[PDB]
Amino acid sequence: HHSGLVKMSHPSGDVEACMVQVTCGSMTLNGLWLDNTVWCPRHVMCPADQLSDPNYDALLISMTNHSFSVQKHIANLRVVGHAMQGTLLKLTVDVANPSTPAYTFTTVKPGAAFSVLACYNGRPTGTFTVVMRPNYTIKGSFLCGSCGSVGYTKEGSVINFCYMHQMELANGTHTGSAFDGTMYGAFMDKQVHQVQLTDKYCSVNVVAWLYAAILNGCAWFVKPNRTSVVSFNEWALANQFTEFVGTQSVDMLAVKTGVAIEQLLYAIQQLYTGFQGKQILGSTMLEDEFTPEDVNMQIMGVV
Amino acid sequence: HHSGLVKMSHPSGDVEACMVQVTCGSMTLNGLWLDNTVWCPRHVMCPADQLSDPNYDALLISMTNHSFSVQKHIANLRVVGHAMQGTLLKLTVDVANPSTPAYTFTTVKPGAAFSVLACYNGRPTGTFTVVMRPNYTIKGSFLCGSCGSVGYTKEGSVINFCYMHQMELANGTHTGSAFDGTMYGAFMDKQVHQVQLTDKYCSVNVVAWLYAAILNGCAWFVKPNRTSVVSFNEWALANQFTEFVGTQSVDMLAVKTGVAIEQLLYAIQQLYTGFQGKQILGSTMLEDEFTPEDVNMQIMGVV
């Protein structure tokens, strides 16, 4: 039986119309064009043999407006101002993007899902959805030249930009910047080995998945036994789970299914030790890549 | 270690600009507007209490051009001709879609991947990628009002439309039409319980996944033992696997990794009996949702 759950992305058209190519010297990557501003990773300024431990403040001083070439592929956009904010550049260009959507900047939290538009040379090439991991990486799909690819969520017609791609870590995961220029997590935009926090199971998303299973008639793991949020969270800290924080979206799943959160918190504690040969929605391990919102939207049609 | 593999869709913007709402009586679903033609499922003609065993030929005769209301949401499009081709309608409208992309119609084969633009009331709402299963269903995410949602592949700038959504089967999977109006598989567009062929593991995609694992340093399952294609295919028929047919994309993975297809065919035969507590790219079961092309593109950057 298929759960009706897929990795679903927002339609990407609004964001495709904002993607540009930025070139500075022998470096080329993607930028995001909104109003009269082009956002891009600051390491576009950096020569290759300096990518490890660059001095970006000196690089910035060395640049003029004419150092930066911005091209749209579907136009040259003339740069008329340049600034550095954290790990991003803010380039001011003479033409406002006539396809600028309604947008905000936001910061995405661990366990939360967002859509990524993967781009190369200013050209959108694919889209996918990821969850921000508890160690502030994402399990994405990015190659050389993908920096400046953007992540976003959507509420209504409004695009909430939350991620600009910067780097691949040694374990194959990825990280980037928020649009205030901070990197997610404790990462720096330098090509040096960095410590990676350990990842954890996102407990709220495992709960959501267990509810999706119940909504598909799969409930063998539901017992009357219960674990308090407080008790579960103490356990979580000792077993590489995030602490659980309920939301209105989780509450809706509890109401529709008639199964209490605390019953599924107990179930997780038991399922963690093992599935004993049974499966849940085709899986023999806990799944934390689907959010309560995904389950409410894709299975129940609920906002 | 993360494989660098995600469920990747094409950017959807070209296709979003082709989506419309079609209404006929008290039925509303999505249509695809290309040139002067709007394609949509023929059951838009059907009243609710006739959805099981409708007589579409009579319904068609009963309709005039004015029976059909086509609306774009981002315009009313006046219908000036109507025809039925298999399980689709072809509506001719007075205005050619000025955003019509370069396109073809094609039929997608089992194991092959395509992108879906899920739409409601003519409004694109999400995108995801699926593989056509060996029993001509897809494991999608579709609700009431999603019919007329389209699937497609892309080569260059050319969009190859391959799927228009029609129905959900009892096991939660989905099926639809090709744009010649045939349903995939042996399904009919009637709301009656229908037999479903049994599904099978897509052997070529499991091979691709095993190569992805090797490309990520995970090769404990590779032995010098080998199984011929011919021998494997006899086995496959007895164990709910598709018969394996190699391609240039699989050959490229063999060359890059230095592991022969026949070594991985042997591995599959053994791994099918069990993983014995080991994992492959985080999984304890065979994965057939990634194609040789996905692996070549996402991991190696190869066309």
Provide an overview of this structure.
Chains A, B: It is found in: Host cytoplasm, Host perinuclear region; Host membrane. Chains A, B: This is Orf1a protein. Chains A, B: It comes from Middle East respiratory syndrome-related coronavirus (MERS-CoV). 2 copies of one chain form a homodimer. With 303 residues, chain A is an alpha+beta fold. The first copy, chain A, has 3 domains: 1-16 and 102-199, Trypsin-like serine proteases (Thrombin, subunit H, Beta Barrel), CATH 2.40.10.10; 17-101, Beta Barrel (Thrombin, subunit H), CATH 2.40.10; 200-303, main proteinase (3clpro) structure, domain 3 (Orthogonal Bundle), CATH 1.10.1840.10. Chain A contains 7 helices and 13 strands. Chain A has helices at 13-16, 56-62, 203-215, 229-239, 248-257, 261-273, 292-300; strands at residues 19-24, 27-34, 37-41, 68-71, 76-77, 79-85, 88-93, 103-105, 113-120, 123-131, 150-155, 158-168, 174-177. In chain A, the strands form 2 sheets. Chain A has a 7-stranded antiparallel beta sheet with strand order 5-4-1-2-3-7-6, with no helix packed on it. In chain A, strands 8, 9, 10, 11, 12 and 13 form a 6-stranded mixed beta sheet that branches. In chain A, a hairpin with a 2-residue loop joins β9 and β10. The first copy, chain A, is elongated, with a radius of gyration of 22 Å. The A-B interface holds A 1-14, 16-17, 117-118, 124-128, 130, 139-144, 171-173, 216, 284-285, 298, 301 and B 1-14, 16-17, 117-118, 124-128, 130, 139-144, 171-173, 216, 284-285, 298, 301.
